[PDB]
Amino acid sequence: RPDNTAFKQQRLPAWQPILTAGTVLPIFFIIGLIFIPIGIGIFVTSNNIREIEIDYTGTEPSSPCNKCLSPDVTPCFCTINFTLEKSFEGNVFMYYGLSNFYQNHRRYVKSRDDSQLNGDSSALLNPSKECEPYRRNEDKPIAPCGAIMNSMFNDTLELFLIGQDSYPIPIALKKKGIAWWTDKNVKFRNPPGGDNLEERFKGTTKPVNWLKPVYMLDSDPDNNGFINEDFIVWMRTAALPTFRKLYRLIERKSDLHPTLPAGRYWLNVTYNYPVHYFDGRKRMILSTISWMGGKNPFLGIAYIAVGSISFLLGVVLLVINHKY
Amino acid sequence: TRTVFVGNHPVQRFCDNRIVSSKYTLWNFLPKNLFEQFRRIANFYFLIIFLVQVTVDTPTSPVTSGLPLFFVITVTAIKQGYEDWLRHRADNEVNKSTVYIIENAKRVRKESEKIKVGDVVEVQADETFPCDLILLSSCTTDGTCYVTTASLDGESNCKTHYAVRDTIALCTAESIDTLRAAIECEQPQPDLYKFVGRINIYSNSLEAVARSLGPENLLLKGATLKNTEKIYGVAVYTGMETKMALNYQGKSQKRSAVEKSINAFLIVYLFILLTKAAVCTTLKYVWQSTPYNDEPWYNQKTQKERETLKVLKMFTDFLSFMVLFNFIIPVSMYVTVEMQKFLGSFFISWDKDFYDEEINEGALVNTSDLNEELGQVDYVFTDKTGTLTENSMEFIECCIDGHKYKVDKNREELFLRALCLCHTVEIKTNDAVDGATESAELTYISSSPDEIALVKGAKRYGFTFLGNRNGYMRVENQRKEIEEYELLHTLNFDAVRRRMSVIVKTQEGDILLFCKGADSAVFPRVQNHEIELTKVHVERNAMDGYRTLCVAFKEIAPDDYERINRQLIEAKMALQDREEKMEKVFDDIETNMNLIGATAVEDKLQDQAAETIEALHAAGLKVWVLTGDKMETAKSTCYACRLFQTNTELLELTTKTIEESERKEDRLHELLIEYRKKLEHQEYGLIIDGSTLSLILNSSQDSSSNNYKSIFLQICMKCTAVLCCRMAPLQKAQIVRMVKNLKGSPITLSIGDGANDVSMILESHVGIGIKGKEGRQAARNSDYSVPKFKHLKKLLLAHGHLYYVRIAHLVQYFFYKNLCFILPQFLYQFFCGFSQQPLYDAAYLTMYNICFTSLPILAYSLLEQHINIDTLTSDPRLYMKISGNAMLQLGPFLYWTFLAAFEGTVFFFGTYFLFQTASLEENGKVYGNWTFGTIVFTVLVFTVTLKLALDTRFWTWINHFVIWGSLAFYVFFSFFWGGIIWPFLKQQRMYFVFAQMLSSVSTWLAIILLIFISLFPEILLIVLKNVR
């Protein structure tokens, strides 16, 4: 009489996995054998990635850049000598690092105005109140309000090669295409309408610490302001104190010649950005990218350790049972 | 003591006939539901958090704490508000049905809500009773009506109720003729079976002929009237006072030990939350010490924020850390553990293995809160006759004057008359076609199957009872001589006294008091010379497993009978404690009665009443049998059931070895402290009595160098077999009380089928009522009700086991998943200026509990069998002994907490080590801190979902659905929220974080590896258990 359906009687059709030895050991062995190969292909792809990082902060009495470690005539100019022992093959990526720089600070991440950087004419002429101490000055609204947009990395790094002569061959760096495609073509637009970009930014100012307005960050209108890729790239927060942000990308030359031949190079810095205060470092990193990113051994060593601990357990188990 | 006047005409203080079974109203639903929700440790906590978020400035938006709460609160409010609109609807249907009233020679048709105490209601046939009536008349003579309380207490037999004699002359015409009455009745009690009253019918000149009422007249409210013409009643209780409406209070037992572990876990997670917040503030101010760790020139405070008092900042930062780590406490645990108990209360009444083909009923779940207290039971207290042995009494071997009649013509006749009288059999009036049976249909329909058996056993010989002809009693005395009798008084039976009696008047002469009772309660008052002769047959019959009743009689004289007349009618005409004032009267009416003989009745065990006590002794329980029957009858039934095995040394504390106030203690201590602690399951079993248990408990207030009750409980706990004979209905509860206290909380169960067992079924943790031959009196005081003993095996073993496992692994996992959530966000505070910056986005913070992880565990807690429900009952040997609350102890709790700590550490510090890369793409683009949080959240969501997918051993299509669909909804919501969710937002912070995080083979491999490293300490236990 009681409703004798599959569900009310707690006898639905089910699977009920049976977990028995011959159903539980080949697991350890399969993951061991699938990981160690992966954790070796990865380890090798990593170790085959050539990178070099030059810490050009100064602070070392003998360093070339200690002449602008202190607050000096605004346009310092130092240069550091590095040497590429083993040439760089693919297309290369130049980053810039920063230590003890908390771009991931609650007060610092809050400090943007997305409605304004997204071209909303209403929020252009009255920035939000999250970008607070840098929201108005000189009785006007700041164009890229906030801390994030104000403390934007602003020193120019350049690379030179030293040929069979001593003359410097100027390596050619490229600025376009270093920021997420979306958040340069969608999430960051310029104020709505107009022909010249200094008209749109009409009732606004330039942030406190900057030196030129936003509408004078670059000459090609496709990289000018709110769309400047270096701006967009600084604005994506670091997530850890020691971070690094893509600065330039050197594209492999269609010839059969490496991008960065071995030899001696100058890295000359127009040292602008001060990090001596909060005890930070500034580094320039030249690296080559693989199918997996950059040189980082964690993935390889971790896959290998997991696939050689699973296999050790699988062997201990096969021993225990099939011997017992 | 209320005094109603029949027609409401003289010779207001009273309620109105409107029942309200609901709780709320249309105007105090919120004010009354919210207050009762927000009174719970976690609802109040999240309301506090929401208010601290709305007043202060905090890390996490106010929506993330008040959207997950406005939902968990509005879901329970909808559930309870509907589950009460049902009660409103039902009350309306009940008390908005027409009911005719004889106002003044006028048959008005009011509504049942407009009836007032003391007005002649007129009920037609098949029409339920509008209120507690008092049947003042009927159409047919004989003044009787058939009522069937098919709804009040579940029963389905047509009980018969009696009118008031002086009133049956009133029928449909001028019954409103100022029938002067004064129905003095006791104050409303929910007893549902007792009633104390008195009438004062007045004549034209002077009369006070008051017929003392009882439960024989009161036609309860809501008890259908069957197979009659029409009745007139004088409402006495008028709704919200009538028992049917006073029995709405039946909740206060449902409190399990898995509702206090939820609170211990909540307290621990609160003191984990406070330690997280306090550590993070202590270290936020040992970090900000350095002048450049606050406002270092790239982020600089605001004037206001800079010139704020300091201590105020320490307080506000502690608050912001409690409001950041505030999710370590589950928001959706309450609504899920309530929807689970709701939707899963049914499985234990939908079951077709609790379905008795005879009773044509199944099981019945009167409290869906102990559901998980069945899988925890530690003791089981049973009743012998009715549960272990169904009341199919077969009369065998009467014994007249110690002769074993099978005495020539002197007293056998008297013995057979005794058997035929001194009962309340009440043959079914109408008889079917006669000729296919032995005598006729003559279906003896009594309430006590011990009387039916005796009448059938007298019929085996000459006598044949056929009477009850409106005040008379007829019997064929071995010759077709009807031989009318006359029932003058029926000294009914009560479990405590153990004697039923009757005072008949011979057809042509004197009076005779017949008395049938137990031997213990009938030998004390007899002519002692015959005890020594009949007790040997009583003892044989007992030792062979038969129920023995002694039959005695007394010749009453006129003047002595005229004295007993007053002594007995003044006991019923008295409104104050008439049951007691009447026990004390017909307890001296039965003083020195000439013992006639004894009668033995054989009874059989139920279907599987031995293979169930074996299945209960196997699963660890300790089955005690608290009976009221004799000591050798109970002992024989216990040996049959396999309670006592063949090679068991029995410890008898009965009256056969303890006839001395001090000689009891001798054994009491000798066979415990020098015997059963110095010296098994099959070897030791105890056998106590009622008088001896009284001696132990009651007057053990004098000798306490070695406490009596203490030494005795010590004797008991070393025995898994105990048989408490001759136990009364209140000692049956004294025993459960004694046990509920010792050495912890032994979770007791108590299973009974009679009116004696209505006391322990109420005392013990979870009570089970059987629905058998006696009535449905216990089945309605009980928490569960099964129509058989053998159903206790399935109930405990295969329903408590699953009901307990499902909720213990819902409770453990609800805290696991949240410690896993929140440990990455606590560890991120170091790799942050301790600035309380949320690791995860806001949509993620709200959704995790109410969307991404809510269903899988609910579907698991409903449809899941970690041991197939067939092997569960096939094997009690352990499968039940395995979880004596063990699944929610410290051991498992800390295993789960350490697994969640390990997994949170792995999530965070695997993404941390992966983000040392300079790029995770192949175009060399860098990932922010929103792509760090979505990586940690992806790993978290998948690891918790797959830790549950590794736990399910029973994969219904619904498990497949909820698990893989929770994962696919995380993955579809994250893409949908990445894309356009713009206009109403102030952030655009996660605009493509997911769709870019997933464009990196390196993040794919990292997510796979971290899910695996996090599930390893579990795939390892799986294997270590599959092996060895």
Ligand SMILES: *[C@@H]1O[C@H](CO)[C@@H](O[C@@H]2O[C@H](CO)[C@@H](O)[C@H](O[C@H]3O[C@H](CO)[C@@H](O)[C@H](O)[C@@H]3O)[C@H]2NC(C)=O)[C@H](O)[C@H]1NC(C)=O
């Ligand atoms: C490159 O970036 C640096 C640091 O971000 C810029 O330095 C700041 O520049 C402004 C003017 O452009 C300075 O005036 C500001 O100095 C602070 O204090 C002075 C007075 O002591 C006050 O006038 C300013 O309001 C400001 O609070 C500089 N801040 C520093 C040095 O930390 C630098 O100008 C940029 N150079 C470029 C764009 O070439």
Ligand SMILES: Nc1ncnc2c1ncn2[C@@H]1O[C@H](COP(=O)(O)OP(=O)(O)O)[C@@H](O)[C@H]1O
């Ligand atoms: N109808 C009856 N008339 C007289 N004595 C009875 C009757 N029914 C039971 N008894 C006596 O009362 C005792 C207790 O009955 P009860 O309390 O119902 O428990 P149980 O039926 O388990 O013995 C019986 O053992 C018997 O001695």
Ligand SMILES: *[C@@H]1O[C@H](CO)[C@@H](O)[C@H](O)[C@H]1NC(C)=O
């Ligand atoms: C590059 O560094 C060298 C070091 O002398 C310097 O001569 C050269 O001018 C620098 N680059 C510029 C700014 O031309």
Ligand code: ALF
């Ligand atoms: F059969 Al009983 F109390 F012994 F109901």
Ligand SMILES: [Mg+2]
């Ligand atoms: Mg009985």
Ligand SMILES: [Mg+2]
């Ligand atoms: Mg029972």
